[PDB]
Amino acid sequence: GEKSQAYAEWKKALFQPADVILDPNTANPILLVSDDQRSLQRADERQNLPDNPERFDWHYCVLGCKSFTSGRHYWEVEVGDRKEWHIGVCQENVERKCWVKMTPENGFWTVGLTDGSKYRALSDPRTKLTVANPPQRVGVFLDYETGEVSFYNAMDGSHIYTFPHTFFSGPLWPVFRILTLEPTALTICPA
């Protein structure tokens, strides 16, 4: 209650609430972006889509519709009871076609879940997270100037992970990744 309230007030003191919608033109051909562009699901197989340059052809990734070149931004994602997901930010210049490892070195700052219970930061090497209360809703917090990407349990204000401070190159995009075919979608919370 107090921890929720402190979490709400910290977001207001410091971070601009981003209104994030998914760009279907970036989505891997196995992903479905909802008609309202807030939700993501996976298909049984690749659907037939143009291989336009911005689309992720290998990684099961999709980007937001707007980038960040400066400032403090947050958005929250309802991951619900999904067994698998990764979210965060990536540089505009990430490899979209060939495989690259999703690491900060390759322009990806993401954390997530595998096999229902394995929380990880996709640092290199990967960081094993210990999470006492598994989140249904995750806040993604960006500070462009200080090279800061951090993640919170948006329901109880508990911290999940902060990447080492870095230097970003060029615009950052919200990025979302699902590998599994399971009943719960990934849904962005509007601003």
Numbering used by the authors: 323 to 513
How is this structure described in the published paper?
Consistent with the results obtained with human BTN3A1 B30.2 domain, HMBPP-08 binds to VpBTN3 B30.2 ΔC domain with higher affinity than HMBPP (KD = 55.7 nM for HMBPP-08, KD = 1.27 μM for HMBPP). To investigate the detailed interactions between HMBPP-08 and VpBTN3 B30.2 ΔC, we obtained the crystal structure of the VpBTN3 B30.2 ΔC domain in complex with HMBPP-08 by soaking HMBPP-08 with the apo-form VpBTN3 B30.2 ΔC crystals. Clear electron density maps of HMBPP-08 can only be observed in chain B. HMBPP-08 binds to a positively charged pocket formed by basic residues (H381, R421, R442, and R448), aromatic residues (W380, Y382, and W421), and a hydrophobic residue (L501). Meanwhile, the OH group of HMBPP-08 forms hydrogen bonds with the imidazole group of H381 and the main chain N of Y382. Furthermore, the methylphenyl group of HMBPP-08 forms hydrophobic interactions with residues Y382 and L501. Although there is no direct interaction between residue K423 and HMBPP-08, residue K423 forms part of the positively charged pocket, which is conducive to the binding of pAgs. Aligning VpBNT3/HMBPP-08 and VpBTN2-DMASPP-VpBTN3 B30.2 structure indicate that the bulky methylphenyl moiety of HMBPP-08 would clash with the loop region consisting of residues 505 to 507 of VpBTN2 B30.2 domain, which prevents HMBPP-08 from associating the VpBTN2 B30.2 domain to the VpBTN3 B30.2 domain.
The primary subtype of γδ T cells, Vγ9Vδ2 T cells, are activated by the non-peptidic phosphoantigens (pAgs). Herrmann's group and our team have recently confirmed that alpaca Vγ9Vδ2 T cells are activated by pAg-binding VpBTN3 (18, 20). Here, we report the crystal structures of alpaca butyrophilin 3 (VpBTN3) B30.2 domain in complex with the exogenous pAg analog, HMBPP-08, which is a valuable tool for studying the mechanism of butyrophilin-dependent Vγ9Vδ2 T cell activation, and the endogenous pAg analogue, dimethylallyl (S)-thiolodiphosphate (DMASPP). The electrostatic surface of the apo-form VpBTN3 B30.2 ΔC structure shows that the pAg-binding site is a positively charged pocket comprising residue W421 and six basic residues (H381, H408, K423, R442, R448, and R499), making it more suitable for binding the negatively charged pyrophosphate group of pAgs.
